[PDB]
Amino acid sequence: SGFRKMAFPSGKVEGCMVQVTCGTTTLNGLWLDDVVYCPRHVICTSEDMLNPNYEDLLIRKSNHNFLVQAGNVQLRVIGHSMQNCVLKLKVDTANPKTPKYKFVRIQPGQTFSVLACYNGSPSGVYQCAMRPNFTIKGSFLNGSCGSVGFNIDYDCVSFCYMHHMELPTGVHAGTDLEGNFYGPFGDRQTAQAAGTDTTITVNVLAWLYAAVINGDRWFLNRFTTTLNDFNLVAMKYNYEPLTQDHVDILGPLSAQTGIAVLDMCASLKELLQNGMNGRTILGSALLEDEFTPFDVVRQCSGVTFQ
Amino acid sequence: SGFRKMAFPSGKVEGCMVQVTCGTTTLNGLWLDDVVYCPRHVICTSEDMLNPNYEDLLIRKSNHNFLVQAGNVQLRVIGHSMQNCVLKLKVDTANPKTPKYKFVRIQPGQTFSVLACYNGSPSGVYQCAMRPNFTIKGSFLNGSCGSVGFNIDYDCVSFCYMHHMELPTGVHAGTDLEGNFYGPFGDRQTAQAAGTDTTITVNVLAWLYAAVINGDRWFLNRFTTTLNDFNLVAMKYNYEPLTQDHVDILGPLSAQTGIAVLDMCASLKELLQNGMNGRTILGSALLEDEFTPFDVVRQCSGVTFQ
Numbered sequence: 001s002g003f004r005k006m007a008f009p010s011g012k013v014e015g016c017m018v019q020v021t022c023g024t025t026t027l028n029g030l031w032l033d034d035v036v037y038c039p040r041h042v043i044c045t046s047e048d049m050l051n052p053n054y055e056d057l058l059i060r061k062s063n064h065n066f067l068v069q070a071g072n073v074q075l076r077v078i079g080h081s082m083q084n085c086v087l088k089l090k091v092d093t094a095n096p097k098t099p100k101y102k103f104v105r106i107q108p109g110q111t112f113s114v115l116a117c118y119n120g121s122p123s124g125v126y127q128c129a130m131r132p133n134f135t136i137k138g139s140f141l142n143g144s145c146g147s148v149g150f151n152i153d154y155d156c157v158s159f160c161y162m163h164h165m166e167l168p169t170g171v172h173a174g175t176d177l178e179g180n181f182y183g184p185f186g187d188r189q190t191a192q193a194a195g196t197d198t199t200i201t202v203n204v205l206a207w208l209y210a211a212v213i214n215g216d217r218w219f220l221n222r223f224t225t226t227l228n229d230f231n232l233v234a235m236k237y238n239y240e241p242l243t244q245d246h247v248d249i250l251g252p253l254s255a256q257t258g259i260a261v262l263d264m265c266a267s268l269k270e271l272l273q274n275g276m277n278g279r280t281i282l283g284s285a286l287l288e289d290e291f292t293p294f295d296v297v298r299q300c301s302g303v304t305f306q
Numbered sequence: 307s308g309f310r311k312m313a314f315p316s317g318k319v320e321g322c323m324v325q326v327t328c329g330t331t332t333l334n335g336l337w338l339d340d341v342v343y344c345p346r347h348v349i350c351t352s353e354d355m356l357n358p359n360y361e362d363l364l365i366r367k368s369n370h371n372f373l374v375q376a377g378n379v380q381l382r383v384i385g386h387s388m389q390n391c392v393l394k395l396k397v398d399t400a401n402p403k404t405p406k407y408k409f410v411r412i413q414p415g416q417t418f419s420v421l422a423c424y425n426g427s428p429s430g431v432y433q434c435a436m437r438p439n440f441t442i443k444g445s446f447l448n449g450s451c452g453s454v455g456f457n458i459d460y461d462c463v464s465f466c467y468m469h470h471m472e473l474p475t476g477v478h479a480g481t482d483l484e485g486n487f488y489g490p491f492g493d494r495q496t497a498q499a500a501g502t503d504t505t506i507t508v509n510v511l512a513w514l515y516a517a518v519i520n521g522d523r524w525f526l527n528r529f530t531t532t533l534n535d536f537n538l539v540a541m542k543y544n545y546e547p548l549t550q551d552h553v554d555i556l557g558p559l560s561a562q563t564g565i566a567v568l569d570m571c572a573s574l575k576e577l578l579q580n581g582m583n584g585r586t587i588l589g590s591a592l593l594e595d596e597f598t599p600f601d602v603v604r605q606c607s608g609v610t611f612q
């Protein structure tokens with residue numbers, strides 16, 4: 001029993017973190033085989049943050065303008081290139097701790113673990129979601145760029161995020177590991193700001209299923225809803241539309257609990273209209289939307305507490 | 307900016323997890339140097355869970371009744387002993403990944419990271435607190451026993467918890483790494499149940515300081531309180547008494563924010579009496595008590611967003 005915001009074990013990623021310095025700027029890089037991946041803004045200077053021309057900045061650099069440190073050991077850079085908003089620094093040493101890995105570009109609503117790092121040294125691990133507005137509600141300070149987000153399947157680390165920017169509302173923007181930003185954001189100092197966000201409906205439903213698995217039914221009701229009628233309510237509460245694909249994805253949780261998806265939708269509809277009336281669900285007084293269906297199956301018992 | 311439930315990087319602990327089997331029971335062990343530590347209830351059988359005599363059960367076992375598996379490799383047990391509620395299995399191989407470590411017995415209110423494991427394989431990491439009633443609100447299933455809780459300081463892992471039991475309310479009980487239970491609990495099937503719990507006042511105050519550091523002051527007020535008068539209110543709301551030692555521990559956060567501790571106590575008093583009135587603090591609609599003062603300093607900027 002229990003239900004926590006649960007991150008993946010971070011060891012396989014810890015062994016990949018290094019420090020990258022260019023000029024007076026230091027941040028983190030990800031060392032896989034003989035390449036170190038890092039944010040290209042490591043090459044910027046303070047007077048040229050408004051609209052850096054990265055091609056023009058990078059052509060002025062040599063391999064030896066980049067310092068890479070793995071623990072106490074200097075790795076010599078033997079090549080460099082820019083791919084979108086990341087730099088790939090070829091180094092003279094292949095990382096002996098390189099895990100089996102993939103690069104993935106995730107969809108909004110998916111979750112991942114973040115290994116926050118500073119000066120190439122891991123600091124902490126937490127779970128986040130890609131919000132519908134393509135920001136993440138991370139926890140990051142100066143020097144955290146190049147920290148990565150990931151999921152682990154069997155022994156394979158799927159890297160999905162590299163940290164680049166903090167927006168005016170204190171939320172975060174970054175890229176996939178090929179250097180493409182999530183959302184409309186970019187690596188320049190402009191007026192960019194998070195668009196209006198929405199609540200991830202399919203995730204809220206998954207978490208209500210988690211609560212049932214763990215033995216709590218107080219919020220259920222005798223009603224059902226059509227998908228169309230549910231979505232009319234979702235829209236009023238700034239919830240993402242629920243699609244038939246979401247309904248299909250909730251199939252296994254529905255089967256394990258005996259609660260049809262549209263019946264759980266009727267429960268959620270009532271919770272939105274009535275509030276929780278001072279009660280909690282899985283220790284929260286808010287409807288939680290940063291657990292996917294997969295996250296629930298991963299953490300919960302396969303046997304419902306009936 | 308941001309503030310998350312942040313666990314320590316788990317890699318140093320991952321490298322210590324093994325599987326221990328005795329009879330038909332399998333659980334996790336912690337392999338440090340040439341010893342594997344695990345819950346002694348690995349030697350129990352289903353018909354003798356109500357009041358096992360562990361001394362009598364263990365004398366009937368040989369070294370070769372214990373199977374220890376590290377990944378795909380069998381470690382041969384060459385000695386065994388019982389210390390309180392843990393078994394120490396001496397093995398023929400010292401763990402080459404043993405980190406610098408200590409065993410610590412923590413005080414109630416302190417937090418730690420849990421590496422949940424099954425069959426010797428790490429599954430996930432989350433943060434918990436030792437509750438005032440010496441339970442932990444963990445997330446654990448069958449096979450999770452022997453999973454450990456820890457903090458990391460510099461390169462040194464301080465192990466503070468090993469998982470043993472789930473109580474009827476779905477919360478958890480376990481031991482220090484010397485096998486002494488936290489709280490009145492034990493490794494037998496009885497009517498033991500969590501005592502009444504309280505909210506960890508010093509931690510709530512620390513988290514209010516975190517909210518100020520991160521730029522939010524909405525909940526402050528112009529009042530102050532004496533410690534005695536605050537504690538009269540704390541008691542009414544089932545909060546732990548605040549001591550002068552707690553006030554001293556909050557010193558650094560008070561200095562960084564310019565908010566005297568007793569003034570933050572007056573803010574908390576008002577929050578308890580008035581509620582949050584539909585607002586949130588650091589994304590929570592409840593007053594959070596599983597961040598210590600140290601946790602706040604560890605995660606937050608040293609510069610307040612004034």
Ligand SMILES: *C(=N)[C@H](C[C@@H]1CCNC1=O)NC(=O)[C@@H]1Cc2ccccc2CN1C(=O)[C@@H](NC(=O)C(F)(F)F)C(C)(C)C
Binds near residue numbers: 027041145191
């Ligand atoms: C990475 N090390 C750092 C992470 C930030 C620092 C505070 N919290 C974080 O998450 N990233 C930056 O400081 C970036 C780097 C950058 C590249 C090109 C141009 C300008 C910058 C400055 N950075 C910002 O995140 C700034 N934000 C923005 O400019 C914008 F809001 F995204 F538009 C700022 C946080 C104001 C320094």
Ligand SMILES: *C(=N)[C@H](C[C@@H]1CCNC1=O)NC(=O)[C@@H]1Cc2ccccc2CN1C(=O)[C@@H](NC(=O)C(F)(F)F)C(C)(C)C
Binds near residue numbers: 355478496498
């Ligand atoms: C460890 N692998 C397992 C972890 C449990 C299983 C469900 N969630 C958990 O956290 N621990 C047990 O199953 C223990 C072992 C044990 C030792 C001696 C005597 C009886 C047991 C059975 N266990 C329990 O946790 C049971 N709880 C209790 O007996 C009590 F509430 F603590 F009193 C029970 C969860 C009912 C199986």
